Design a protein around this nucleic acid. Structure first.
Lengths: 51, 171, 216, 124, 144
RNA sequence: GUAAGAAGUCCUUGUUUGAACGUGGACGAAUGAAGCUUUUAGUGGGCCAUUUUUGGUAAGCAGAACUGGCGAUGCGGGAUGAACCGAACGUAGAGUUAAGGUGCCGGAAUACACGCUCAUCAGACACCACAAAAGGUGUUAG
RNA sequence: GCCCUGAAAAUGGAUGGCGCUCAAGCGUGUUACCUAUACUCUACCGUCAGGGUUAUGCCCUGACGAGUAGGCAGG
């Protein structure tokens, strides 16, 4: 009789998409990335900056 | 809006007979990547035989100023296909960044010539390393030793409607 | 008998949760791998280009009066029957010609997973023979489009964004999205120029997310 | 052009009408020019051709006789038959797909290299 | 605005009820509405559609037409059905012993059928005999 | 103009050196969503606008070909206005906007920023649309 | 590029008026804001369609509502 909206009302959110529970547990949106240090090329920075 | 500098590269699409074509690069002043890419194709159609369907862009990137706090004297080449065949202009702008120079240039052209973004073409913005290569007098005005000057009329912004003071503009 | 009902529900629910976890893994590893490919090209001194977008979202911008017949018919075909109504479309040459025709009267672009999810959750309405039925439950989708293996609203979002074999059927099941006017406004003073000329219509390619998030 | 006479035309084949100026006999049909019709009967001297001509808003059926000099084999169904045979082959291979056609798709990701092709910057 | 495409507020026609005022006919359609709704048989929907028809579109059907229908192969013992009216025919001399159901029989036609041996029946009795229309043969009269 | 398939493809031999019919076996680009009669009102050389094109001269303009709108149509704006901009209407409420606007009349910044301009009746949409081709020891930037 | 002139009469007169001069004018850019019978949400009325049910009625669901000549229906 009345449309209730997910993105509010965690109950009707959880009626659908039950992955949301563990999603919020692991938090999965403030998730950190594996660090790397792949430096770029001299030709790349050169042709970016000029000529 | 507040402009940005964008590096753009175009590949015009490979064929059999011709793998790996020649990757033409350009520097654009524009608000965002959409306008930057449109301007890229607009200049590339003039220079060479390419098309947005006949070509592709490889790497859109941003260029930030290496020293955006160091004050600089830029010289700018400009041209605009009006009213005659195209004719050029050299202007000088004292500012910190190429972005600010281009912004105040567009505003100055709109003011002093009624010439518009659609009408204007940027050829080359270039920092002038050495003094005595500065040609224009309104920029030469500001390079003198131990420069000082006042602001003799101060008028104070008032938040209220009424004042009980008979205000003063001093300094 | 009620225990049998609950057992079937529990089975389908576990299926949904493993499917959704798989989809999350797919999306994150895909974007991470694209990023690392860009970085690898940069490190090797080569350039990496991303795949051209295959899905676009389109929004109507102009009313119904004094519309010429060809764009009127094309908007009928794309189910943009009124102002601010919107639809997803798969982009090929055949559709690009339509978009070229209806550029003055629509704003379109390349949407994000976040806005697709928000649209399908808040304004997601479905067609059950007719009628614009609100979704409200995964059963309504498992009935109609369980033929195509789409048992959940997230499976539907996946078939939409990852354009699948049955994108046509899922999108036609989806009623045209009814949207409001943006809360922050349109920005520009005058709408009916291109996005490039300080207008609003035409392709903007990423800011459609901002626009539809203001409008939804 | 003698190759316009060693041309078998069996009932069922589709042909375009393009009448050449070099033969005053049987120059047909002012606007039946570049129009296609299948052949219904053949005699000597002769081939039959039928065309769906529209009058008002219905397609009526006009049957006609023409000299062989004006008619020409149609390459209308070349890709159709090629695709049908290739579809049979692909269906056999499947039995061992998207055999349907598809429009031009968006080109996918790739990598562009800089080995001897450094990008050449320029301006107006 | 909406820029409609389908000429909103269509009526669909199709005669949901009869123009008549015969209470007995209204009992008949009240019965066949239940039957066509609950049975799933198509025969009952056909009969209900035919009951709404007018006199112009319910032509009479003759004894001779019925005998033609019964001369068909494997169709002699079927319960023939005419929703309209059934007339006599003095052109045929031999008539089967069939069962037939209809709204209205004429006196001569009823007499001929009874004389051959069969019976004349109403649609409600046809319903309590064969709800789904099992082993039935519907006939219609020439329209023009 | 035609074509984009199950009224289509591929094996099976009786009737003019072979064609047609017939026998039986194996299997298709995108998007979006019915047909048949029957019968009768009112209107059936009226007004406006755009762009295609023929002929045009003091200037205007006259003929045809689409399209859109008014006629029948209220609402917001343009100070006011049949055909300009937006947008088409059930009765109410809350929110967001369009076009147009935010010194006072008048709801909304006498907001921010860069320049230019002083007119002895400046200007406050222009249109190498008219006055029109220039003149001026007024000013600014090239 | 802006400014002056670049001819136009006759009741008193109009950037709409007041009036405005680093503007309340011209050009351009960045934000905020006002605001329609337009868009979104909800309720109610009516129509239409689809369903259900021992009653030209009862129930569920949804989409729609401009109107002259004129037509049909219910009162």
């Amino acid at each position: 009789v009345l449309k209730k909206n997910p993105l509010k009302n965690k109950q009707v959110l959880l009626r659908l998409n039950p992955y949301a529970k563990v999603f919020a547990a692991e938090k999965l949106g403030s998730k950190k990335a594996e660090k790397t240090g792949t430096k770029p090329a001299a030709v790349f920075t050169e042709t970016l900056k000029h000529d | 809006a507040h402009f940005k500098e964008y590096q753009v590269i175009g590949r015009r699409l490979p064929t059999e007979s011709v793998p790996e074509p020649k990757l033409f690069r350009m520097r654009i002043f524009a608000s965002n990547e959409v306008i930057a890419k449109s301007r890229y194709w607009y200049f590339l159609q003039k220079l060479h035989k390419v098309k947005k369907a006949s070509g592709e862009i490889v790497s859109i990137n941003q260029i930030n100023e290496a020293h955006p706090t160091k004050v600089k004297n830029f010289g700018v080449w400009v041209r605009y296909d009006s009213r005659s065949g195209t004719h050029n202009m050299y202007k000088e702008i004292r500012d910190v960044s190429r972005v600010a120079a281009v912004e105040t240039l567009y505003q100055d052209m709109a003011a002093r010539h009624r010439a518009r973004f659609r009408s204007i073409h940027i050829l080359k913005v270039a920092e002038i390393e050495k003094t005595a290569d500065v040609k224009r007098q309104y920029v030469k005005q500001f390079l003198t030793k131990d420069l000082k000057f006042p602001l003799p009329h101060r008028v104070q912004k008032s938040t209220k409607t009424f004042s009980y003071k008979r205000p003063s503009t001093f300094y | 008998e009620r225990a049998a009902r609950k057992a079937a529900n529990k089975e389908k629910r576990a299926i949904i949760l493993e499917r959704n976890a798989a989809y999350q893994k797919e999306y994150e590893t895909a974007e991470r791998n694209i990023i690392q490919a860009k970085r690898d090209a940069k490190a090797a001194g080569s350039y990496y280009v991303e795949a051209q977008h295959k899905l676009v979202f389109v929004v109507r911008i102009k009313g119904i009066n004094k519309i010429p017949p060809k764009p009127r018919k094309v908007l009928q075909l794309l189910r943009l029957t009124r102002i601010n109504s919107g639809t997803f479309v798969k982009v090929t040459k055949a559709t690009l010609e339509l978009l070229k025709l209806i550029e003055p009267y629509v704003a379109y672009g390349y949407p994000s997973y976040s806005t697709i999810r928000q649209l399908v959750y808040k304004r997601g309405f479905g067609k059950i023979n007719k009628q614009r039925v609100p979704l409200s439950d995964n059963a309504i989708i498992e009935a109609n489009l369980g033929k195509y293996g789409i048992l959940s609203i997230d499976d539907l979002i996946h078939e939409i964004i990852t354009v699948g074999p049955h994108f046509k059927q899922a999108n036609n099941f989806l009623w045209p999205f009814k949207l409001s006017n943006p809360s922050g406004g349109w920005g520009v003073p005058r709408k009916f120029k291109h996005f490039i000329q300080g207008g609003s219509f035409g392709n903007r390619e990423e800011f459609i997310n901002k626009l539809v998030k203001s409008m939804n | 052009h003698l190759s316009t006479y060693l041309k078998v035309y069996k009932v069922g084949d589709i042909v375009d009408i393009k009448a050449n100026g070099s033969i005053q006999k049987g120059m047909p049909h002012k606007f039946y020019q570049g129009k296609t019709g299948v052949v219904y009967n053949v005699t000597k001297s002769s081939v039959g051709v039928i065309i769906n001509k529209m009058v008002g808003n219905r397609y009526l059926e006009k049957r006609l006789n023409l000299r062989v000099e004006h008619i020409k084999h149609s390459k209308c169904r070349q890709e159709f038959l090629e695709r049908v045979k290739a579809n049979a082959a692909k269906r056999a291979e499947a039995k061992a797909v998207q055999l349907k056609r598809q429009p031009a798709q968006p080109r996918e990701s790739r990598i562009v290299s800089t080995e001897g092709n450094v990008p050449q910057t320029l301006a107006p | 605005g909406i820029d409609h495409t389908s000429k909103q507020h269509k009526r669909s026609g199709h005669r949901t009820a009869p123009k008549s005022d015969n209470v007995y006919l209204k009992l008949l359609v009240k019965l066949y509405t239940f039957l066509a709704r609950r049975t799933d048989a198509p025969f009952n929907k056909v009969v209900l559609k035919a009951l709404f028809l007018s006199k112009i579109n319910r032509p009479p059907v003759s004894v001779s037409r019925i005998a033609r229908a019964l001369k068909q192969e494997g169709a002699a013992n079927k319960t023939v059905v005419v929703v309209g009216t059934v007339t006599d025919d003095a052109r045929i001399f031999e008539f089967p012993k069939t069962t037939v159901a209809a709204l209205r029989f004429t006196a001569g036609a009823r007499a001929k059928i009874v004389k051959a041996g069969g019976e004349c029946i109403t649609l409600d009795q046809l319903a309590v005999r064969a709800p789904k229309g099992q082993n039935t043969l519907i006939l219609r009269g020439p329209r023009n």
